[PDB]
Design a protein around this ligand. Structure first.
Ligand code: FAD
Ligand code: FAD
Lengths: 462, 452, 116, 51
């Protein structure tokens, strides 16, 4: 039997943020996670491995396409294991840093499966015995989610994978099939295309990432097509069949596609079945998500849920800040803020980032805006980076010069979009495009785009 | 020829001034003595050095990456990559000039009176140009003291160093300036024992002490030998290597030599005495807050701070002042592109201590940064100086990979007025992950712990 | 011209937009549909739109004109969505009408629809 | 050569042989890179020697 003030379930970004914010408030807090090591999906099976894979693929592409490195010999193809082995050092460093953060503030951890009993009692169960019941006044739910696994699709087949088991690949397949045009699907399609795999990406919609800007989606589709990715639109699978040497997918429309592997990336389902939330009396929808208010509090006054478990936006930074806000709400130390605006980020090759309104929404809302474009092809920093494809678009109000939406696609997109976001968050006349002409930047960087694009807007203004 | 505004120099200052003036609807023209547009920024200064540094970083990462092991290269092969970037930049600038109907004259410009100039090319040209407004963007050149033989094949400057054909075994850099530090870092990355010589006791004293100390430690760990408080006595060029005798009594022998001490304005050929303008010892032109010289219709911009972006902004501000958009370029984020990069904005810790401002320090080390770990660049640091009571940001300093792109968020938060410029923004704003911009958040939290 | 506005994303409009972009003019193509040449394949339309965007052509989607005012130094087009675009010229390529009004088809019982 | 001919005989507006031949190396480099990629993707072993 153990007693605490705040107990967090799951050590992901939401759980870590909630635990840190709560322990900063002076309470005694504990964390529970069924994985043998801390970090959550952000470090073990999700963000960190995929990002290391993407960075290694980008380095491979740049090394192969750099003439200076071609004098040593001919281009060499590399196995998937060698590319993935670079993620082990990164995940080890990250888990060491996270456990050091936990230990420095003296936060107790319990590496075992969690299970709810009542409004205060939880049965943290290990693999062997370890009832180890815990009682606390406040609870944070950061159980996250797992890849969606339809019953009609078998996953025990060695040639069929999901967003988690794909890292278990031993050899680079000649071909590949990706179902679902989500963030994970597009990222893996870009990575495998960089590795040199004819990826047959399958989408359930007619446009890739319809929630993004039309121009950005069109450019991404063109680049994917130019990088051996075959994109099929308005498709629904009918049956997937595993063979000895490949996987054959028969679509509803009548097309059958055979590849050497398969990767399902269509949605995620919250990990709430093992929680036993019915003992609390709370309910989970078909998506496995938990309804929370603007204070990140569930129906029970002492039960708080935040992060990827609640569904939208399912972003690691967003989950982290949501957990911190939920902990602030628990402690009522005026640190709460409803996470609503999150800069959308897609980590393909190259990257995509967005903040604020899109062009289609602005057109529907009849806002008198204007467009300022800056193309990476004419950029000194981009030319030195040997990365020429890309663009940045700034949507700015014509009369008040207010910024209504910033969208970028290319190299360092996520780092670039942050300055536009910072200018966006300003109130009143401070949110102005003229800042980009009234402030000196560094050179040669990619931030100079915010200069050039601004000019491309001001010329269109009369 | 008759025009409204005539600009001398096609660098960032001149190009910006010409573009801003032509945006006003006037008829403008540009003159330069280089056979191609771009200025020293693209042809001899910024762009070639940046390409060299990026190639050095790439080869260093390739060598250190275990995946790429299953290989030293000559200096010429490394420098070859800059030609494509230079060609693309000059093509883009020529397209920008042509699309705007900008007349270009490729010859040295000399002043005749307050309104007209003579353009002389390589083959004895004479062209008269008269305009109401003039812009001076002649840039600068490396300072050349008399007592050093720059004609020696083993002695170079910040310009002729690109003429190197073979990578030297040892090298000497005089002057601990931004250019000197950048070249020392590049040559150290290439694998050359660089002996940097500094006149003062601290590298880049205008920077924060912590940043300078970290940079010095990294340079020392990267085969660069830094000597402090030294002044040259005599440079002697032997057939095999350059020998420098210092005032302290030391003799240093190397296979090359680079001079990066100071810059000299390119005003001797302008003949400013024909219009009533004088140049100081360093060849600079005194200007007011409007970037205007003593003559009412003569304006000078660009090549302090001698920054390409700052020169661009100064040229655009001078053009706006001519057309009546003016803004005095005073606060420029200092950026040194060594390996790793260094950037700073706002007041440093020494100035805050002198002024007794009650501030506090929030740190976020890049060693624990996830994105930095993926980049395999763990050495770094992000320091934020924030006012304790009103939570205003008084200084942002960064030393690491992608420092320049990081510092711009702190600069954007800085320029806000009053309560808007607050550190708590970094707590109430969702960043991208995994990014090193989100490191800001960590730093902010590392500050909020120290509050009470 | 310094700048140019093209109304209608038809064959003629796209051809002239490409020509003027090649000449080095910032073309602002205006389309009444959400996609360029919806009767064509999605991949081909996407590639053409990407090339036009990369070649200084600014494509705006789902727009309908409200008033084309002719200034002395340019033309300002006011759209239904609230966007006003100023250029140094203007080109109309929205459909064609049959040249049958002058034929006088009523003398033979023949008639033409609204499209001529 | 055809482009040179159409340049000289165009109302809108000699060349050294080396300058004219200079354009072929970009094409040959692109072609050899593409063929090497084709060989490597399907895993065909190469031996650069006299058989
Ligand atoms: C390939 C890939 C790449 C991604 N890249 C990004 C990216 O770049 N940026 C981004 O923002 N997001 C990214 N994501 C999304 C990412 O998964 C989430 O944004 C985030 O990592 C989840 O945060 P969380 O703490 O809410 O969930 P989690 O981190 O998944 O929290 C769940 C944790 O609790 C444990 N747990 C689960 N059930 C129980 C239980 N019953 N008892 C005890 N412990 C339990 C789990 O084992 C896990 O450790 C990516 C996802 C994938 C799959
Ligand atoms: C190695 C190196 C690295 C640098 N890196 C950076 C960096 O990363 N960032 C940064 O911001 N700055 C950097 N700089 C500084 C940069 O070179 C200057 O800040 C900037 O280029 C000056 O702009 P300008 O147009 O005023 O001068 P210039 O670019 O020098 O423009 C002067 C032009 O006019 C021509 N000219 C000169 N005299 C005459 C005449 N009498 N008649 C006609 N034409 C004439 C010159 O040939 C030249 O083309 C670097 C400098 C060096 C040497």
């Amino acid at each position: 039997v153990y007693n605490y003030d705040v107990v967090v379930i799951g050590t992901g970004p939401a759980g870590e943020g909630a635990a840190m914010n709560a322990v900063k408030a002076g309470r005694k807090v504990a964390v529970v996670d069924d994985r043998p090591q801390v970090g959550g999906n952000c470090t073990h099976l999700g963000t960190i491995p995929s990002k290391a894979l993407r960075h290694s693929v980008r380095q491979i592409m740049q090394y192969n396409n750099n003439p200076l490195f071609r004098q040593i010999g001919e281009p060499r193809w590399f196995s998937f294991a060698d590319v993935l082995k670079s993620a082990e050092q990164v995940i080890a460093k990250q888990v060491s840093s996270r456990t050091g953060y936990y230990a420095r503030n003296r936060i107790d951890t319990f590496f075992g499966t969690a299970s709810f009993c009542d409004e205060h009692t939880i049965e943290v169960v290990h693999l062997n015995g370890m009832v180890e019941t815990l009682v606390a006044k406040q609870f944070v739910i950061a159980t996250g989610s797992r890849p969606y696994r339809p019953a009609d699709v078998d996953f025990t087949h060695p040639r069929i994978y999901d967003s988690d088991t794909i890292l278990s690949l031993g050899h680079t397949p000649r071909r590949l099939i990706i179902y679902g045009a989500g963030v994970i699907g597009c990222e893996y399609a870009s990575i495998f295309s960089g590795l040199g795999v004819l990826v047959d990406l399958i989408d359930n919609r007619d446009q890739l990432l319809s929630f993004l800007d039309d121009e950005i989606s069109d450019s991404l589709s063109y680049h994917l097509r130019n990088n051996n990715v075959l994109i099929r639109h308005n498709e629904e699978y009918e049956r997937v069949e595993g063979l000895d040497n490949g996987v054959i997918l028969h679509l509803k429309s009548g097309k059958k596609i055979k590849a050497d592997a398969f990767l399902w990336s269509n949605g995620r389902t919250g990990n709430t079945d093992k929680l036993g939330l019915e003992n609390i009396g709370l309910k989970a929808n078909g998506r496995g998500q938990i309804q929370v208010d603007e204070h990140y509090r569930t129906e029970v006054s002492n039960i708080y849920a935040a992060g990827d478990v609640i569904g939208w936006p399912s972003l690691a930074s967003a989950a982290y800040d949501q957990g911190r806000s939920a902990a602030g709400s628990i402690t009522e130390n005026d640190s709460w803020r409803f996470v609503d605006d999150v800069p959308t980020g897609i980590y393909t090759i190259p990257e995509i980032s967005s903040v604020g309104k899109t062009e289609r929404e602005l057109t529907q809302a009849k806002v008198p805006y204007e467009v300022g474009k800056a193309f990476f092809k004419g950029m000194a920093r981009a030319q030195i980076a040997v990365e020429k494809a890309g663009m940045l678009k700034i949507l700015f109000h014509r009369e008040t010069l207010e910024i209504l939406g910033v969208h970028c696609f290319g190299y360092q997109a996520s780092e670039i979009v942050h300055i536009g976001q910072a200018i966006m968050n300003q109130k009143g006349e401070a949110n102005t495009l003229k800042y980009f002409i009234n402030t000196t930047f560094n050179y040669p960087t990619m931030a100079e785009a915010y200069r050039v694009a601004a000019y491309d807007g001001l010329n269109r203004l009369f």
